[PDB]
Design goal:
It is a single chain. This protein has a single domain, classed as Cytochrome p450 (Orthogonal Bundle), CATH 1.10.630. The longest helix has 30 residues, at 179-208. It has 433 residues and is an alpha+beta fold. It has helices spanning 15-26, 42-49, 62-65, 83-93, 99-103, 106-121, 132-149, 161-176, 179-208, 217-224, 232-260, 264-277, 286-291, 293-305, 337-341, 382-399, and strands spanning 29-32, 36-39, 66-67, 70-71, 130-131, 311-316, 320-322, 325-327, 331-336, 400-404, 412-415, 417-420, 425-430. The radius of gyration is 22 Å and the shape is globular. It binds protoporphyrin IX containing FE and the ligand O=C(Nc1cc(-c2cnco2)cc(C(F)(F)F)c1)c1cccc(Cl)c1. The site of protoporphyrin IX containing FE (HEM) has 22 residues, from helix 11 and helix 16. One of its GO terms (cellular component) is endoplasmic reticulum membrane. Keywords: Cell projection, Cholesterol metabolism, Endoplasmic reticulum, Heme, Iron, Lipid metabolism, Membrane, Metal-binding, Microsome, Monooxygenase, Oxidoreductase, Steroid metabolism, Sterol metabolism, Synapse, Transmembrane, Transmembrane helix. It is a single-pass membrane protein.
Length: 433
């Protein structure tokens, strides 16, 4: 008998959907086959995520650390599982995500969002198909590169297609872990790290010549590595931020645009809100963001049904009773905001898209909703992400109407993160048509 055999479990669709079916059938503690245990009670979410006693399970993060023998995220901020090592770097990099730091990024967010809208407006003939997944990804990449690194990827101009291909193949590599695929994945990872080395060299050379370098994420990434023996830790975090800083944001934007294409009444309300708050202004100030209350709620509801980062793992070190189930020591505990978001025990009519769930008067979900995770290992980029997505969405809503091309699906794919299966192909018209 397996050490886990006694635990309840089985004897456009994703693995997370199978997990949801099993959680509904088998209850709050379910074995899935490494063997992990999916824990879906809010009591468990609170117990394990809100304590520094419980740390990430390194075995479950190996696929981010190294892919086919090529160091990827290595021991960067996401994939480092040793508390003390993580804590040291977290505290330093946190400085780049202060309120004042993020306020300064509004210029970048505005400029890239405006560039996107202008590109889209020229195609708004109600006929030309536009992949909103692609366009939102390019926007997210361009935002990240500029905001975090002071680098112009110019993906919105159709530049850096090799870099684009490298990201794609790398993401495929994470999932995979024959002949040509290994070659393409390995070279793509080395490419991304090389991008890092090139840019860090440029930064250091600029600093030496006494040129102006605005403090950014890269500043703190460098700071975290002060007096390191090599640059491998630095490049770990370069790649971590390069990828994490755009991928989930892009996914979230794509899901939101996809969902809203079948929510005309919600779209009408969103259009009205932007009209009242910002009017025809070309630029959103920081104070405008807080005023976009209904948009905030829509984006929260989007993350409930469509969290790009579906959850997290913690290592259970000692045998523990969890919701009446004996769980052996040395076991990965799997938490899923995707699963809990779709369980009727936690959310009434879970498949209904209802922004009012996040309304001012509504009881806030208690440990049943965590698209940015919870506790010490929550997303460092949460406020960064929320700001940039609000800027992008507000400008789209100001200027454009979108219709999803018939045949386009609302299904998901799972490729390290969750994202729309289809390209979110739309036709566009200017608002007032
Ligand atoms: C809507 C967009 C985003 C979502 C849904 C999201 C979600 C998450 C989640 C669920 C985690 C926990 C991951 C885990 O436990 O394995 C996480 C961690 C992280 N995210 Fe994000 N994220 C987003 C945007 C960003 C952005 C914009 C950045 C950087 C600019 C970023 C960088 C990170 C980093 C570095 C971590 C690791 C934090 C730590 O452990 O100290 N994310 N994010
Ligand atoms: O792949 C995992 N996490 C992941 C997170 C992010 C992220 C977080 N914040 C912003 O982007 C981005 C990525 C990607 F590289 F695909 F873009 C992957 C992973 C690996 C092992 C276990 C678990 Cl639970 C999750």
């Amino acid at each position: 008998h397996s050490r886990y055999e006694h635990i309840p479990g089985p004897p456009g669709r994703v693995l997370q959907d199978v997990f949801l079916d099993w959680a509904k059938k088998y209850g709050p503690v379910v074995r899935v086959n490494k063997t992990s245990v999916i824990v879906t009670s809010p009591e468990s979410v609170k117990k394990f995520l809100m304590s520094t006693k419980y740390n990430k399970d390194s075995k479950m993060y190996r696929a981010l650390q190294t892919v086919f023998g090529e160091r990827l995220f290595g021991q960067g901020l996401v994939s480092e599982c040793n508390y003390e090592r993580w804590h040291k770097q977290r505290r330093v990099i946190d400085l780049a995500f202060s309120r004042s730091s993020l306020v300064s990024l509004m210029e970048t967010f505005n400029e890239k969002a405006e560039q996107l809208v202008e590109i889209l407006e020229a195609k708004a003939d109600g006929q030309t198909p536009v992949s909103m997944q692609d366009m939102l990804t390019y926007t997210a990449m361009d935002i990240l590169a500029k905001a975090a690194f002071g680098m112009e990827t110019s993906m919105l101009l159709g530049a850096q297609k090799p870099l684009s291909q490298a990201v794609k193949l790398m993401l495929e590599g994470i999932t995979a872990s024959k002949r040509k695929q290994l070659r393409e994945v390995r070279e793509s990872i080395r490419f991304l790290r090389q991008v890092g080395r090139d840019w860090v060299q440029r930064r250091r050379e600029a600093l030496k010549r006494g040129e102006e370098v605005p403090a950014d994420i890269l500043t703190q990434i460098l700071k975290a590595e002060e007096g390191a023996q090599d640059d491998e830790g630095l490049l770990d975090n370069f790649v971590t931020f390069f990828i994490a800083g755009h991928e989930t944001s892009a996914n979230h934007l794509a899901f939101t645009v996809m969902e809203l294409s079948r929510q005309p009444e919600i779209v009408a309300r969103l259009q009205a809100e932007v009209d009242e708050v910002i009017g025809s202004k070309r630029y959103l100030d920081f104070e405008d963001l807080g005023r976009l209350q209904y948009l905030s709620q829509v984006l929260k509801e989007s993350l409930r049904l469509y969290p790009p980062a579906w959850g997290t793992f913690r290592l259970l070190e000692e045998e523990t009773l969890i919701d009446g189930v004996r769980v052996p020591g040395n076991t990965p505990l799997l938490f899923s905001t995707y699963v809990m978001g779709r369980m009727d025990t936690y959310f009434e009519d879970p498949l209904t898209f209802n922004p009012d769930r996040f309304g001012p008067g509504a009881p806030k979900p208690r440990f049943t909703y965590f698209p940015f995770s919870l506790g010490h290992r929550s997303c460092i980029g949460q406020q960064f992400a929320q700001m940039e997505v609000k800027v992008v969405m507000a400008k789209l809503l100001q200027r454009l109407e979108f219709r999803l091309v018939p045949g386009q699906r609302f299904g998901l794919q799972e490729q390290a993160t969750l994202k729309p299966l289809d390209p979110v192909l739309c036709t566009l018209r200017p608002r007032g048509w």
